[PDB]
Symmetry: C2
Subunit: 357 residues, 2 copies
Amino acid sequence: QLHYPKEIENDLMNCGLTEKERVEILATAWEYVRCGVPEFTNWEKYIAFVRLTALTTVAEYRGKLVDIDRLLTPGEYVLGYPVRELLDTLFAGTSVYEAMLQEYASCLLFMAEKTRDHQSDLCKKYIEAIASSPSRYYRLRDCDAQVRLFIAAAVACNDLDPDFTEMEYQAMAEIGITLYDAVAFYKHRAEAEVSNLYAYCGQDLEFRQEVYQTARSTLWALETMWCKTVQGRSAINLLKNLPLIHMSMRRYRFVEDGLTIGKPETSAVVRAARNHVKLWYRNDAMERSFESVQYMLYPELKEALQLPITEMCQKCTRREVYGGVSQFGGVVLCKDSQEEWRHYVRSSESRHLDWLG
Amino acid sequence: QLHYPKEIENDLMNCGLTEKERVEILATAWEYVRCGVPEFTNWEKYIAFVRLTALTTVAEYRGKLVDIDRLLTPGEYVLGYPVRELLDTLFAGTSVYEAMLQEYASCLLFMAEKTRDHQSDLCKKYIEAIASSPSRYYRLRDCDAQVRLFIAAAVACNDLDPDFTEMEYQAMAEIGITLYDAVAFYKHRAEAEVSNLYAYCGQDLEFRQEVYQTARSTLWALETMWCKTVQGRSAINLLKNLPLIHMSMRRYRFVEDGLTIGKPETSAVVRAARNHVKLWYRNDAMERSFESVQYMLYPELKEALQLPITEMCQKCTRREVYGGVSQFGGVVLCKDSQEEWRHYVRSSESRHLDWLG
Ligand SMILES: [Mg+2]
Ligand SMILES: [Mg+2]
Ligand SMILES: [Mg+2]
Ligand SMILES: [Mg+2]
Ligand SMILES: [Zn+2]
Ligand SMILES: [Zn+2]
């Protein structure tokens, strides 16, 4: 059975969602916030965050329902949520307010673009951008998985002002995505996902085991250094729980898969994702444009969407339309590019030790 | 690499432990407390708890090193730890002080008895007692896995006095052990463990999936009801993280097993446990007596060790010596007894909803 707070139990009504979708979305949102932000003090901000996460959850598989262009507009209700009021409740008066408005809007924008019927030109630029370099992959995947957003929101929900540097967010996101994309590897290969680190680094278990071990070891060092402050724990709890949600949350298959993690995906799981079982989304193979959406983009994504075509790797394999054709759904790196990514991911420890002080 | 606080880095020296054992023990202890007690305010109590957990870790595979009879003695150092000073720091002035002295001492007593060369008569009485009824199994496994102890310690490490009722501890332990013993099922079958719920309930995946799903569902209900208080979260965090340590802690095999959970154990894992890889212990097939140890026993264990032989199930299969002969190592329930256990574990939801209000 699904459990969530009475405050939200009448949310998302009269929206175009069935009763079964509506209760699964509210439960997913609650369970994600609980797992990623286990320590909090401010219930008003916490529930506003859960509501923003319910809207994220809708965007992640039924993007057509979500009016991306009204998310940051004062007074606009999106599926009954006053989105900008919720973001102001969570972040107004913090040092990351403006950046997190862009982070949230940019996330749902490419959630909805990826979960659209017909692939837009803007969506194609995104899919080619996240394959352009491992550092770019990590920064754009941060927004897509809301890693820095959850870390900042967690601090905000303890009535503190997040004080992380840019290089601190970047180190933290690389650690968390290295772990999460490893656990999600078979889920994501079933979704014909573009957004998985190992779609670009390569699919050999040896590499995945190695960099998973290094990421979890760096995260234990970080936990040991940071566990005595509320901001430190806010960060630790999000990162450490990213890989663990596959066992703790009903969004995932631990029970249905016979109490296992890490069994390769089957065409059965492919069809489950297509039919939105656990609110998954299979990307099978333009209306929004750069010009219409660029106000909501954080700087690195705005740059990523305008990369000079003359500097794109020609030995990497592109497609006219991305997604599943019945693997991963995006660019296939050439051996030179793939070695650049594997090198970058293997050099994490030295990079992170520097960035994290 | 292994990470733990500078405070403990010179612990457990000149003890009969190698440098490799010593650093693995300190890391295990730190990682367990971090995972089970992620939210705390009192660093002095926290570090005292980590030290008590380091001593637990020694008892769990090399019990011969641990002088059980000096654990509760004021002024006694056990492997360099002032055990009673540490317990007083953690629990003196709480409502559970006396019960937790008995809980800790009783735990390490049967850790050391189970991890002994020659099986004692007292150890044989324990192994037959935990197979006597599912309720008795759960209460004695609570102490063995330190479930109520960790929950009470967590509250204590937030400078609060644990206020849980006896039926609250019992509900919480059944939830946590139902989850933990399921994830540990293959580890434990490799250890020829006696202390696994499914050794008694039966080994069919269907049953395990069902009761795992019910336990995790009840725990999400409990989290949703209790998450707004520090005592509530203290309880939630321990229970929810029990099954997850198999992915988060280096004590476990997630990385070495190719980033998987739930692959059946092999004779290779059996030999790993025997050779104490990750500080595991294989029980392969009397000096301490009831009279010498009964001062440290909590009431239900003192009763369990004196059960009338006339009331033991004769259709259950006992052995002169327990442990591996190259499965689970204890009593094998008869079909009548096994159905009593499966019935009890399937009736958890109604039992827990009552006990938890
Ligand atoms: Mg997704
Ligand atoms: Mg996504
Ligand atoms: Mg054990
Ligand atoms: Mg044990
Ligand atoms: Zn290339
Ligand atoms: Zn019987």
